[PDB]
Design a protein around this nucleic acid. Structure first.
Lengths: 342, 282, 342
DNA sequence: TTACCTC
DNA sequence: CCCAACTTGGATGATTTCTTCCAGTCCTGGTAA
């Protein structure tokens, strides 16, 4: 390796905002409210000490409530559907290092990206990214609707339409006249990812049909423990509109974390995909699948490039020859960052 | 080494010379020359040569006539007249003064005797007490006389000097008249007025210069132009003298009084709250 | 050389401010926001030591997040286009040393500038500066828009208009009715650089057509690593309006760093140009292309001025015969500085 | 009427 | 009036700290031959 090496971020959304329409005004923001509640005194250490004698608590002392201050968000009465919208840009920006201090490293990283491009493989990554947009997984915990409709309009003049996204799986075969749109979208994106000087934009709007006063789940703020007994313990993220009103939103990197969730190349058993990570982090189980001790992480693999180019170059292409190790590496270069001080 | 000159300075602790009387006469005689002419204070030859010069020694013997215990010129070189030699007053339990200190003398006459005065007026510890060369010769101290004759002095030259050296310390110990540039202040004493003239104690000021630097006391420095014209100690200190600095942490009723330019130097030893003798006066 | 020798800066911008219009108010500033995020524990030395055994880290220990504090900036919902503006002044100020302690050096520097002016040459420098203004490369990382429109007005009564600047190259032939405006602008500036007592001003505005909530990239401040965990690690540069509002901006020297990027005279192979620098510093590769060891730097070249004047004076001129070494030197004198202690 | 000296 | 006020997992990685030449006076002492 070498002292300096960096790549930039080649795929990115802006933020998502919730709103609804009225008969007289086309854009009304969804907003949040704040309130004080009476909670429970419960859970471990409420009544225990290192699981020994359960302290010296009198029977009546746990019948008391525990008050708290929280923020919450609900759809108002008589609104039949809620809209959510965001924009997405894609750039062919993994073809070249943002910074590299070593001409011998540089010629190889370039040779590899090109060796890969012409054998196919950007189609593979594009298919995986495209599937995640049309499935709707970027709504996170708000997927539970009575019906979800997704529409996309790109800068090249195409239109895509999924009449109901509630049941499209990661693994399976999509119903006819939807499979068709996954193929077309893949082609626009596969190009955008590898050919330079194309200015490609997507504009994604989804509609949520909801319950009478359904609760909505926007991004939370990261805060420290409060000590004024007045400020809300849980706080939600909003944006300011041109006229000064506030609206609920989902943060950029939270939308992005969902879109890039395409990694099932480990252990020769696909299961469910992980968010691409140099160490294979798994947040649900609090562990790591590509721990350095296994030889399966990014940094071990980064040093084999000379051997990968040799294989990719010797193959004919357009076949089934691309291994999991090459695909993984390309996915990491797409989510660019700092690979330095070797 | 310059440290030898430091330890013989009036502002340093006194050092013992018991059993070293021969080199003590050599060093002390060698100090009478300008520093630019002397490569060492330890050269026996230079000392034997200086000792044979009756004129050089005569000029040195003459400085004895103005050795003092209290310095009437200290704050102002213009004061003219006689020296002052007085034993320290009885100790008062509530007052810091020279009463608790041993006997010491200094020198201050025409400002050209800075080097020549060092032969007889330089003190040292001997037989475990405080003395100087003039006192040991006047008292007929045989050990010093035997070393001095051994360094080339004729017995007849010593027999004459013992007399002239003693004579210079036998008179003019109190001024005849009050000098025109001295201070005079008057207060009631035993039912009537008396005029008081203060004077600075040599022994007391010299000790203070050492204590404030060793005990780390709060202090500042007072400058004197032409140090040679004020005295032994002021010259040795290069015209900069240390004093204590202790400022405050800031029926007929007189309210709101303002004073401009009050004297903040209470006595030559202490800066701080103005002298209480002045308020009683007011 | 000599003890004192200085030139002043002959070409300079003020600063660039982002704003947008409303139906009721013409100048509304774009402003910045601050927020907490949850990051990743990743990269070398997170899990490695001298590339040996990857320490003694338990598998679960890398699944933890790494929180960070950043400032960021986004365009608010429903604004159709964003404006950016700055002013530019140019002075004929490379004809004479600001300070010179040696009359024999002085007569030579004067001789040279004049010998150069009358053979042609300021036209060449003016063309290169002019091309960079019209192209729009001073927007740095904000060039990726749906359309870029650039408009310029000057103190002599001229107006220039590039309807769409997104595709004009450093090297190539510009489309018709754009090539023409490049020629006209070159002429005004060639004079501004060479004749005294012309007070020439330009006022440059551009418009950016953007995405729904596209991110904007203003200048950053230079800071030291904080340890209070309360101050943002990434801080952005703003200005204060006369009414107290703040706005995002680009620093004067960051606009200037782009405009003066006209140096492809090294190694007899033009490639891409570098920012004019006495040692040819290359910021992307972390190196220097006119290292003193090559004899190609400013200081070696400055000592041959006597020889260059002789050639210029003997040559006919009016053609393309001037060497790269003379052009380089004049470019450095334009970006004046301190050239002493020989 | 002249000069002689303190870290 | 009256009763309560919350457990947890976590707080960064890279390399650089500049230069040229200057530093004003004058009036303000006792003492001796």
């Amino acid at each position: 390796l070498c002292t300096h090496l960096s790549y930039s971020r080649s795929l990115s959304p802006g933020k998502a905002v919730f709103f609804y329409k009225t008969a007289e005004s086309d854009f009304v923001p969804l907003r949040i409210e704040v309130a004080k509640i009476s909670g429970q005194k419960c859970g471990y250490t409420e009544g225990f000490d290192a699981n020994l004698k359960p302290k010296n608590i009198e029977r009546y002392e746990l019948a008391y409530s525990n008050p708290q201050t929280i923020e919450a968000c609900y759809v108002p009465p008589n609104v039949d559907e809620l809209y959510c919208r965001f924009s997405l840009r894609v750039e062919a920006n993994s073809m070249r290092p943002y910074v590299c201090s070593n001409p011998d490293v540089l010629r190889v990283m370039i040779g590899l990206a090109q060796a890969y491009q012409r054998l196919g493989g950007y189609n593979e990554l594009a298919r995986r990214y495209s599937a995640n947009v049309l499935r709707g997984i970027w709504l996170w915990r708000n997927q539970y609707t009575q019906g979800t409709k997704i529409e996309i309009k790109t800068s090249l003049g195409s239109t895509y339409h999924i009449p109901d996204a509630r049941r499209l799986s990661w693994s399976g075969d999509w119903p006819e006249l939807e499979q068709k749109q996954l193929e077309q979208l893949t082609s626009e994106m596969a190009k955008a990812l590898s050919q330079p000087d194309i200015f490609w934009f997507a504009d994604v709007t989804a509609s949520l049909k909801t319950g009478f006063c359904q609760e909505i789940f926007p991004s939370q703020k990261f805060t420290e423990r409060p000590d004024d007994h007045s400020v809300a313990s849980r706080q939600l993220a909003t944006v300011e509109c041109s006229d000064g009103q506030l609206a609920a939103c989902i943060n950029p990197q939270k939308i992005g974390a969902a879109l890039q969730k395409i990694d099932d190349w480990w252990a020769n058993d696909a299961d469910l995909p992980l968010r691409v990570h140099e160490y294979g982090a798994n947040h649900e189980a609090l562990t790591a699948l590509r721990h350095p001790a296994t030889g399966q992480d990014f940094y071990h693999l980064l040093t084999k490039a000379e051997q990968f180019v040799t294989v990719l170059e010797s193959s004919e292409g357009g076949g089934v020859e691309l291994p999991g190790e090459v695909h993984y590496l390309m996915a990491v270069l797409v989510k660019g960052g700092l690979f330095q001080k070797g | 080494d310059r440290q030898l000159r430091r330890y013989l300075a009036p502002y340093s602790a006194e050092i013992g010379v018991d059993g070293a009387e021969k080199m003590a006469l050599v060093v002390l005689l060698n100090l009478t020359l300008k520093r630019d002419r002397v490569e060492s204070l330890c050269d026996e030859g230079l000392a034997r040569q200086l000792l044979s010069d009756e004129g050089h020694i005569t000029n040195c013997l003459h400085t004895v006539r103005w050795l003092h215990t209290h310095n009437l010129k200290y704050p102002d070189a213009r004061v003219s007249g006689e020296r002052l030699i007085i034993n320290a007053p009885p100790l008062i339990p509530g007052v810091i003064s020279s009463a608790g200190l041993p006997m010491r003398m200094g020198w201050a006459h025409d400002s050209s005797d800075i080097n020549l005065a060092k032969l007889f007026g330089t003190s040292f510890r001997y037989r475990d007490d405080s003395t100087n060369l003039a006192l040991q010769l006047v008292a007929r101290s045989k050990t010093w006389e035997q070393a001095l004759i051994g360094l080339g002095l004729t017995q007849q030259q010593l027999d004459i000097w013992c007399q002239l050296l003693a004579s210079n310390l036998e008179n003019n110990t109190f001024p005849t008249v009050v000098s025109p540039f001295s201070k005079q202040v008057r207060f009631l004493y035993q039912g009537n007025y008396c005029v008081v003239t203060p004077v600075v104690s040599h022994a007391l000021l010299a000790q203070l210069q050492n204590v404030v630097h060793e005990k780390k006391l709060q202090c500042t420095y007072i400058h004197h132009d032409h140090p040679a014209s004020v005295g032994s100690l002021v010259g040795a200190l290069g015209g900069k003298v240390a004093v204590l600095d202790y400022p405050p942490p800031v029926y007929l009723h007189l309210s709101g009084l303002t004073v401009y330019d009050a004297s903040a130097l209470a006595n030559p030893y202490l800066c701080g709250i103005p002298s209480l003798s002045a308020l009683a006066g007011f």
